[PDB]
Structures are given as C-alpha cells and as structure tokens.
Amino acid sequence: TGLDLGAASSFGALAPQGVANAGATVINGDMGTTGTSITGFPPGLITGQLHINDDTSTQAFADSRTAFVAGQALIATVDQAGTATLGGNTFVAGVYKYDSAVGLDGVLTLDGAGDASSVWVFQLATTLVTYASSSIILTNGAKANNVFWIVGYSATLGTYSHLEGNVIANALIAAQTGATINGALLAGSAVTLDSNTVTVQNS
C-alpha cells in the first residue's frame, strides 16, 4: 500500500506555480514546473532533467496529484487525532492520521521491523512544520522511498532539518536554510528552497 508517483517519481522538486531557490542547493533528481518560472539555478544545481512547462512536467504534475488523492483516500491504521508532535517517537509501518497541525522537534524514528517493504503514510490534515536540526531516522529495513508525507495544507522544513520520505503537499513546500531531504518535494503550489540538498530515493 505504497503510492505510485508515476512520471513524478524521478523529481526532487515539482510544483505548478514554480520553484524559487536561494543558495548552493543541490537537487539529485529532476526538477520541474507546469508554470514557467524557476529561479535561483544557479546558484542552485540539479543533477537530472529540468522540465519547464512541457509534456513531462504536465504528466509528472498529474501523477503527483493522483498520488496525493490516493494518499488521502487510504483508511488510517493509526488514528493520532489531535496529537501535535512527531518528535520522540518510533513508528512501525502504518497509515497515520493526524487531524491538525503537527510539528517535528527532535528525532522521529521509522522502524522497518525487519521488513524492507514497510510503508508509512502520514495523513497530515493541515500543516507540517519541522524544527531546526530536527531529524527523521530509518531503522531495521525502513526505506525512505516507502515513506509518504501527505500534507493537507503546506509543509515547512526547519533550518538544517533532515527529512526522509516523499513530501506531497496540497499547497506549498518551503525548505528553510540548510534543510536536507532523502525523498522528494511534490508541491501543489510552489516549492521554495534555501541551500538545500534533496536526493530522490528508489526501491
């Protein structure tokens, strides 16, 4: 019960209303927009293909929204209700449902429990915020590309934070200075970046 990102699966950063970057960002992956503005490359750099307003962009965007729809349609296996904090937890495979704003301060561990095909789907009804130097850790087989952050509004990643997983946001994804991602940023409005490293993971 992982999500298929389709043509989006090679993209480190994808958004309809553009990507804005500052600083020596490195995207180990493709980057695109169905709009026409990318700013800040250079000093940002990507290793893969740039797709600005072309067929790949259109298709990748649509698959990203498809994946988003699926991520929200899954039935939760853990209901976290109003819990506001992710940090300080170890979570095995699951569809975790949170009803409002969540933050990650400290360390969230994802425990593959011995099984590499472990899947996490975080259904975050509203915002995700991670804090400065917060981190997500993988253990016992957990793979980043089997982690899905389904963000009902927008995500903000804290300065020097580290995130594992595919971030699929309904609206904005803003990565603050020095945040690093093993995963992808698939936004419904814009992606903004500052001196980030985003490294697309496979399975």
Residue numbers in the entry: 1 to 203
Relevant lines from the article:
Here we present new structural data for an IBP identified from a cold-tolerant fungus, Antarctomyces psychrotrophicus (AnpIBP). The structure of AnpIBP consists of a 45-Å-long β-helical fold with a triangular cross section. The main constituents are 6-ladder β-helical loops, which are supported by a long α-helix located along the β-helical axis. The AnpIBP uniquely binds to the water molecules that participate in the primary and secondary prism planes, which were detected as a prism ring in the FIPA experiment.
